[PDB]
Amino acid sequence: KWYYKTITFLPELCNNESLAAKCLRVLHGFNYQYETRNIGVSFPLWCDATVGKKISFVSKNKIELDLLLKQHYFVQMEQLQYFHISNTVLVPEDCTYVSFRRCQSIDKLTAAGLARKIRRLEKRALSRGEAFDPSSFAQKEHTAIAHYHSLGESSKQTNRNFRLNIRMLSEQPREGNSIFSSYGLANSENSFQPVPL
Amino acid sequence: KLPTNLAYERSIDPSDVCFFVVWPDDRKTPLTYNSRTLLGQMPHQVDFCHVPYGASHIECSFSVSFSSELRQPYKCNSSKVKQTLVQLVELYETKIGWTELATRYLMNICNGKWLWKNTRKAYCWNIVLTPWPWNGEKVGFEDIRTNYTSRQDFKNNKNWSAIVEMIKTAFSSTDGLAIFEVRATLHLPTNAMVRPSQVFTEKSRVFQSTTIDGERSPILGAFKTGAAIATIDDWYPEATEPLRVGRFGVHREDVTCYRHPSTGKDFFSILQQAEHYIEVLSANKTPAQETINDMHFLMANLIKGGMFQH
Amino acid sequence: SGQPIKSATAEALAQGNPHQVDFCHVPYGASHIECSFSVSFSSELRQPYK
Amino acid sequence: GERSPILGAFKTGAAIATIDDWYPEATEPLRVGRFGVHREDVTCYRHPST
RNA sequence: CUGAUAACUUACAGGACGCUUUGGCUUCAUUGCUUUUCAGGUGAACUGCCGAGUAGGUAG
C-alpha cells in the first residue's frame, strides 16, 4: 500500500549528494515536530558514481508523505525550478526492492575514527590493572572498501560536520510497518527494511 | 663556449629522511601508514599517515655530505674552458669567500626547511647535528620557532663558527669532506598528519616508502630533501622569496619560471660571460649589485651541476 | 647559439620532466657494507698467445 | 635468489691497471692502454703523433 | 547498326614392381657507459554511546 513522490533535480549541472543530504536534513527537521519513523529514502537512479537526479519518499500513510513535502523548502525550490515533485502515485506489484543502509563502520576506519576508538577503549579499561599499551594498536597496512556514497550531513545542536555514508543492496521484499528512522533508513538497530526503488 | 661535452658532479649529498614514532617509554618504532582503496562496485589507492595515539613525539633522521667536486669539471672535453672555470672558482674563493653560500646552505639544515610541511601546526621541534670530522659535543638547536628566527639567532657563537668553517674547507681543499648526521624531534598535536614524499605514477597520494625492521615506512625523498637545502636563490631580477637553484630559476607552486633566457639572468647567459667575470674579480672593488649576486648563482649551480653541454 | 622558437616559454621550461633511475642506498640500522672479490696474477706475458 | 648490484668484472680490472703516469708530462695515473686515453679529459694523450 | 544475322563435342579407362649416403674435425685473444633531478591532500569525514573485545552495532 506504498506511494512515492520522486523529486528530480533539473538545472543540468549540480552536485546530487549536496541536494540528497539537504533533502534528508529537511526530512530530519521533520519527524521531530511529528515524532514519526515511517518515511524511507528510495534513491531510484543509484549508480556507482553520481547518485541520480531524483529521490522519492516512499511510505504507507500518504498523509504524512505529503505533509512533509509541503515544508516551505521543497515548495521554495519549486517556483525557482530546481525541483519537480510528483503526484503521489502507488507502487506497482512486481518492483525492484533495494535497501539503503547507513553503515557507520566507515566513519571509524578514518585515522580520527581509530584514535577516537582507541581513546574510548582506553577510558573503559577501568576494569583496572594493566594500562594496556596504545603501542599494540596499528592500522594494518591495506583496507579494500566499497561503496557507501557519503552525503554531506551536519549536526544542528552542535556545529559539527559529520557524514552519513549509505550502501544499496536488494533482496527480501517485505518486513516491518515501516520501521525507518530520523534520516530515512535501512539499518537502525532493528531492521533491514527494503525500499521499492 | 659550451664545449659539446661538459659535466659537473654534485658537492652536497643528502639521504632519505627516516621517520620514527618515539613512545612515552622512550622506545622508537618505524612510523607506518594506512593505504585505503575504494573497491568500486560492479588502481585509485590513497595513503594516510598520522601519529599513533599515545605517542611521545616523532624523530626524523638523515645525513648530508659537503665535498669538493665544484673545483674541477667531471668531464670537460676542452683544455680552454676547464682552466677558465677552475680559475673562476679559485678567483671567487679568494675574492668573496664561501661564508655566504655555506651559511645559506647550513641554515636550511639547522631550521628544518627539509621537513617541508610537518613543522606546520607543531608545538616544538629541535635539531641535533653530529658533524664529522669533529672533536667535541653534538651541535644542538632547541625549539626552532622562538630563538632561531634570523641569521643572528644562529650566530650564537657556541658552535656556529665551528660548523660553517669545515663547509668552507670542504669547498676550499682538494678531497675536502664534511659529513653531518641530522636528527630532528617533532612534538606534534595528538593524531597530527605526517606529510612524506609521494610516488610519481604518470596519469591519488601514493607515498614513497622504505623497509625498516621488516615494516614499510614513509621516507620524504632523497632528491626532495636536496631541493630544500638548495632553496637559497633570491638574486633573480627583483626578488620575492628563495627559489631552488636551477638554470632557469623555476618556481614550482606557480608553474612560471624567473631567470628566463630573455632576462639574461639564467645560468647559460651568466656562464658564457665567465671570461668577463675573471677581470672584474681581479680589480677593487666588485659590487654586491648584480656581479657578486651572479657569482653566487654561478657557484650555487656548480655545487649542484649536471651537463652544461651542446 | 641563440634562443629557440617561443615554445620554450617561462611556463614550458617549468614543466616537470620525469626520469626513471635505479636507486641503491644502505638500509637504516645497518652496521656497515662488505665488498668482496678475487684477483689472480699469472705469467701469460712470458710468451705470446698467437 | 635476490637481485644485487655488482660494480663489474672489467671495471675492477681498470681500477687495478690505473698505474700509467709515464705519459709525456705527468699529472695523475691513467688506465694502461694502447693510446693512453683520459676518460675525464675527453682528449687522448700518448697519441701516435707524440 | 559489331569478319553482321543462327550455332550442344561428346561418350570409356588400374602406372606400376625393387632399393644402406658415408667416413674426419679446437673459433679465439682485449675491454670503465657516466654526469643532474620536489609529484603534488591550503582547512577538510567530528563528538559520543552500547559492547569482554583492534568483533559487531549505534545517535546527532
Give the cell for residue C36: 668482496
Question: Which residues of D make CB contacts under 8 Å with C?
Answer: 5, 7, 12, 16
DSSP-based three-state secondary structure for A167:
strand
CA distances from B295 to B88, B132, B274, B301 (A): 9, 29, 9, 10
Give the cell for residue B150: 634570523
Nucleotides of E under 7 A from a protein CB: 29-41, 43-54, 56-60
Experimental resolution (Å): 2.9
DSSP-based three-state secondary structure for A140:
coil
Assign residue B116 a region (left: φ > 0; alpha: ψ between -120 and 50; beta: otherwise).
Answer: left
- Which among A114, A110, A131 is positioned nearest to A122, based on CA atoms? A131
Task: Please give the helix or strand (H or E) that residue A142 lies within, else none.
Answer: strand A142-145
Å between CA of A104 and C1' of E50: 14
Alpha carbon of D15: minimum distance to chain C alpha carbons (Å): 12
Task: Tell me the C-alpha distance between D38 and D30, whole Å.
Answer: 6
A147 → closest Cβ in B33, B41, B50: B41
- Which among A100, A77, A90, A79 is positioned nearest to A26, based on CA atoms? A77
Question: Which residues of B make CB contacts under 8 Å with C?
Answer: 1-2, 15-16, 18, 61, 200, 202, 210-213, 222, 248, 250-252, 255-258, 260-262, 310
> What is the interface size between C and D, counted as CB pairs within 8 Å?
6
- Which among B185, B220, B144 is positioned nearest to B56, based on CA atoms? B185
3 state SS for chain B: CCCCCCECCCCEEECCCEEEEECCCCCEEECCCEEEEECCCCCCEEEECECCCCCCEEEEEEEEEEECCCCCCCECCCCCHHHHHHHHHHHHHHHCCCHHHHHHHHHHHHCCHHHCCCCCCCCEEEEEEEEECCCCCCEEECCCCCCCCCHHHHCCCCCHHHHHCCCHHHHHCCCCEEEEEEEEEEECCCCCECCCCECCCCCCCCECEEEECCEEEECCCCHHHHHHHCEEECCCCCCCCCEECCCCCECCCCCCECCCCCCCCCHHHHHCCHHHHHHHCCCCCCCCCCHHHHHHHHHHHHHCCCECCC
Chain centre to alpha carbon of residue B265:
22
Chains A and C touch (3+ CB pairs under 8 A): no
B53 → closest Cβ in A115, A140, A143: A115
Instruction: Kindly report the number of other CB atoms within 10 A of residue A182's CB atom.
Output: 14
Task: Tell me the C-alpha distance between B55 and D12, whole Å.
Answer: 49
For residue D7, the chain C residues in CB contact (below 8 A) are 35
Q: What is the DSSP letter of A134?
A: G
Task: Tell me the C-alpha distance between B241 and B252, whole Å.
Answer: 13
Q: Looking at chain B, which residue has its C-alpha nearest residue D39?
A: B75
Task: Tell me the C-alpha distance between A121 and A127, whole Å.
Answer: 11
Chains that touch B (3 or more CB pairs under 8 A): A, C, D
Task: Please give the helix or strand (H or E) that residue A115 lies within, else none.
Answer: helix A111-123
Question: Cis ω on the peptide bond leading into residue A178 (within 30° of 0)?
Answer: yes
- Which among B129, B99, B130, B126 is positioned nearest to B112, based on CA atoms? B126
Å between CA of B152 and C1' of E10: 123
Alpha carbon of B214: minimum distance to chain C alpha carbons (Å): 11
CB contact under 8 A, B210 and C10: no
> What is the interface size between B and C, counted as CB pairs within 8 Å?
42
C23–B contact, CB cutoff 8 A = yes
For residue B48, the chain A residues in CB contact (below 8 A) are 110-111, 139
Task: Please give the helix or strand (H or E) that residue D11 lies within, else none.
Answer: helix D9-16
The 10 Å CB-count burial string (b at 16+, else e) for B137-173 is eebebeebeeebeeeebbeeeebbeebbebbbbbbee
Task: Tell me the C-alpha distance between B135 and B129, whole Å.
Answer: 13
Q: What are the two backbone dihedrals, phi and then psi, of residue B170, each rounded to the nearest 5 degrees?
A: -60, -50
Alpha carbon of B256: minimum distance to chain C alpha carbons (Å): 5
Task: Tell me the C-alpha distance between A71 and A26, whole Å.
Answer: 8
Give the cell for residue B8: 659537473
Å between CA of A112 and C1' of E1: 102
A141 → closest Cβ in B29, B35, B190: B35
CB contact under 8 A, A140 and B36: no
Q: What is the DSSP letter of A91?
A: P
- Which among A103, A115, A98 is positioned nearest to A41, based on CA atoms? A98
| HSE toward the beta carbon, residue B179, CA cutoff 13 A | 6
With vertex at residue B164, the alpha carbon angle to CA B162 and CA B165, rounded to the nearest 5 degrees, is 65
Task: Please give the helix or strand (H or E) that residue A100 lies within, else none.
Answer: strand A99-102
Alpha carbon of B169: minimum distance to chain D alpha carbons (Å): 23
D43–B contact, CB cutoff 8 A = yes
CB contact under 8 A, B250 and C14: yes
| HSE toward the beta carbon, residue B287, CA cutoff 13 A | 3
Torsion of CA B156, B157, B158, B160, to 10 degrees: 90
Which nucleotide has its C1' atom closest to residue A160's CA?
Answer: E46
Which nucleotide has its C1' atom closest to residue B305's CA?
Answer: E36
Q: Looking at chain C, which residue has its C-alpha nearest residue B251?
A: C14
Task: Tell me the C-alpha distance between A61 and A180, whole Å.
Answer: 13
Which residues have CB under 8 Å from B40's CB, separation 6+? A48, A49, A146, A147
CA distances from A125 to A11, A115, B135, C12 (A): 54, 15, 51, 60
CA distances from A149 to A46, A111, A152, B41, B260 (A): 9, 19, 10, 11, 47
Task: Tell me the C-alpha distance between B12 and B68, whole Å.
Answer: 9
D5 → closest Cβ in C24, C37, C39: C24
Q: What are the two backbone dihedrals, phi and then psi, of residue A66, each rounded to the nearest 5 degrees?
A: -100, -15
> Is the CB of residue B206 less than 8 Å from the CB of residue B64?
no
Q: Choosing among C5, C15, C28, which should be mutated to test the B contact, i.e. which has the most B CBs within 10 A? A: C28
> Is the CB of residue B280 less than 8 Å from the CB of residue B289?
no
- Which among B55, B52, B189, B54 is positioned nearest to B119, based on CA atoms? B189
Task: Tell me the C-alpha distance between A109 and A165, whole Å.
Answer: 12
Helix, strand and coil percent figures for chain A, each rounded to 5: 20, 15, 65
For residue D43, the chain B residues in CB contact (below 8 A) are 77, 79
Which nucleotide has its C1' atom closest to residue B244's CA?
Answer: E38
Task: Tell me the C-alpha distance between B44 and B37, whole Å.
Answer: 6
